Amino acid sequence: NVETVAVSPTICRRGGAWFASFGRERNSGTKLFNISGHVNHPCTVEEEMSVPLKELIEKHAGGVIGGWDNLLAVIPGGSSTPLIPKSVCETVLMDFDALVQAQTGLGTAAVIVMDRSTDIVKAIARLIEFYKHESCGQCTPCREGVDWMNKVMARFVKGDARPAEIDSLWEISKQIEGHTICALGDGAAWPVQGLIRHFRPELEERMQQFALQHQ
Amino acid sequence: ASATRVIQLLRNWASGRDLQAKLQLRYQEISKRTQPPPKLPVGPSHKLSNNYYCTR
Numbered sequence: 001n002v003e004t005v006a007v008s009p010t011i012c013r014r015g016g017a018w019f020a021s022f023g024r025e026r027n028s029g030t031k032l033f034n035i036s037g038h039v040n041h042p043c044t045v046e047e048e049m050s051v052p053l054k055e056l057i058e059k060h061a062g063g064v065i066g067g068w069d070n071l072l073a074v075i076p077g078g079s080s081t082p083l084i085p086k087s088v089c090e091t092v093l094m095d096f097d098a099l100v101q102a103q104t105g106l107g108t109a110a111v112i113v114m115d116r117s118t119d120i121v122k123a124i125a126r127l128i129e130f131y132k133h134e135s136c137g138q139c140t141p142c143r144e145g146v147d148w149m150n151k152v153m154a155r156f157v158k159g160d161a162r163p164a165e166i167d168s169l170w171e172i173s174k175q176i177e178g179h180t181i182c183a184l185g186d187g188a189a190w191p192v193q194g195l196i197r198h199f200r201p202e203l204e205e206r207m208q209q210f211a212l213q214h215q
Numbered sequence: 216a217s218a219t220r221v222i223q224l225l226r227n228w229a230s231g232r233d234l235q236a237k238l239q240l241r242y243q244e245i246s247k248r249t250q251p252p253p254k255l256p257v258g259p260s261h262k263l264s265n266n267y268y269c270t271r
């Protein structure tokens with residue numbers, strides 16, 4: 001990666017120990033951070049590895065729009081990583097191990113924040129549509145299953161589906177992950193899993209509202 | 216059954232029982248030859264998840 005190559009000469013000049021002094025064990029160094037979405041000051045900043053997410057947002061991004069209580073969800077490491085809600089975002093650190101223990105992963109350290117005035121299902125569905133448009137089509141699980149996920153997700157936003165399917169969708173994602181040639185299939189499966197795991201009531205309520213409205 | 220009273224009594228007495236109670240000819244008590252459509256439920260393997268064929 002560009003960042004690894006670009007930091008190697010400074011590591012050589014200043015020493016491995018100087019770089020290793022930062023962060024926790026097995027999480028050494030300083031990492032570039034991108035903050036985007038529903039923040040007052042979206043920006044790119046360089047900061048110590050194991051920073052808290054809330055500290056990073058409140059210090060460098062100017063805070064989440066409408067105050068911290070207005071936070072709904074965060075995707076901490078780019079679209080591939082699953083999202084985490086406010087309850088876990090409160091006291092989570094920004095590194096590989098800590099973010100894995102939160103069932104997400106550090107990824108590329110691309111924080112994308114969403115307040116409570118956005119449609120979380122719509123945002124995840126847009127990410128799935130991006131993945132559908134970006135798959136190379138070489139192997140059948142990614143090609144077929146990501147197209148299928150895209151179609152299911154679009155229906156989910158509307159609420160046109162039924163409650164039983166959600167589990168179906170979860171199973172479909174499992175089938176894709178670990179069965180493809182490359183990790184694009186995993187990167188499409190994980191956001192769906194995160195959305196299901198943390199916002200199943202929202203999907204159920206949307207389906208119920210659609211069923212009530214359509215009789 | 217359209218049988219007269221005297222004929223009914225004679226056949227009942229010859230048979231030794233009441234024949235009008237249990238007639239071997241069928242009448243309007245059978246079901247109609249046109250019926251409403253059925254719905255016909257599905258079986259237990261019609262789930263959308265937790266339904267892998269290797270487990271059944």
Ligand SMILES: Cc1cc2nc3c(=O)[nH]c(=O)nc-3n(C[C@H](O)[C@H](O)[C@H](O)COP(=O)(O)O)c2cc1C
Binds near residue numbers: 001183
């Ligand atoms: C679908 C997909 C897209 C990727 N895109 C990039 C990318 O744009 N830039 C990048 O540095 N790594 C990308 N990666 C990860 C690369 O494999 C990575 O660069 C490689 O492992 C070496 O990176 P490293 O210097 O961090 O070890 C991508 C991986 C996948 C599965």
Ligand code: SF4
Binds near residue numbers: 137139181183
């Ligand atoms: S998982 Fe990777 S190799 Fe397979 S179809 Fe998707 S992009 Fe192509």
